[PDB]
Design a protein around this ligand. Structure first.
Ligand SMILES: CNC(=O)c1cccc(C)c1Nc1nc(N2CCN(c3ccccc3Cl)CC2)nc(N2CSC[C@H]2C(=O)NCC(=O)NO)n1
Ligand code: NI
Length: 193
């Protein structure tokens, strides 16, 4: 299985582990993990975080052939589990978390979108447009110990977490771009830039 291969001590996640558009797994709703977690489920979260760290390092990213990322979801590794990793550097890190069964439990009426549009590791093409998301979200999740966390996110952090949660719900960023006018600025839409 993907999880067995990826959680081998020797394995370093790279782009060859990341599935792309066309793979049904990206359009599938991931299964909740149960507690207590298996060792493999814990190692997987740690491997995902290590990938994010590698992808953000100029030397390692060049050596390993990595696209940069600030978030990753298990389904992108062909593992249909509700596990995401987020690692957002400060303008050391603004947000660093491995989240098990993450869930948005509240959100703002106001929307937001990155002014530069979004890129996805599973998408090997540019898809222009404002990806419309909630401006602010309250997120529940469990850490590796089964402890519950409840956090409130805004700005870039809010966008990234919603992006990764979308992955575990079979949703892709371009699903949220305005079909007619990709760059419409609707009332209540905050453009981040
Ligand atoms: C289409 N627009 C862009 O690609 C883009 C261009 C300029 C600026 C931004 C913010 C853009 N959009 C973007 N950019 C990023 N990058 C910016 C560069 N980062 C980076 C690059 C090299 C070294 C170090 C770093 Cl930090 C990684 C994150 N991630 C995401 N997406 C949209 S929300 C989640 C985020 C992401 O991580 N996507 C990867 C993914 O598919 N996760 O599932 N979206
Ligand atoms: Ni993505």
């Amino acid at each position: 299985s993907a999880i067995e291969r990826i959680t081998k001590a020797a394995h370093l996640i790279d782009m060859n582990d990341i599935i792309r558009e066309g793979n049904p797994t990206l359009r599938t709703v991931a299964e909740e993990v149960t507690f207590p977690l298996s060792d493999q489920e814990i190692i997987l979260g740690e491997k995902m975080m290590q990938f994010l760290k590698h992808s953000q390092d100029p030397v390692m990213a060049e050596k390993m052939g990595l696209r940069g990322g600030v978030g990753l979801a298990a389904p992108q590794l062909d593992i249909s589990k509700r596990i995401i990793a987020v690692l957002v550097p400060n303008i050391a890190y603004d947000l660093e978390a491995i989240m098990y069964n993450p869930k948005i439990v509240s959100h703002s009426v106001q929307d937001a979108a990155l002014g530069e549009g979004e890129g996805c590791l599973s998408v090997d093409r540019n898809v222009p447009g404002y990806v419309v998301r909630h401006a602010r979200v309250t997120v529940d999740y469990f850490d590796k110990d089964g402890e519950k966390h409840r956090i409130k996110l805004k700005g870039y952090n809010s966008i990234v977490v919603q992006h990764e949660i979308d992955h575990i719900n079979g949703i892709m960023f371009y699903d949220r771009i305005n079909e007619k006018d990709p760059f419409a600025v609707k009332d209540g839409l905050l453009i981040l830039e």
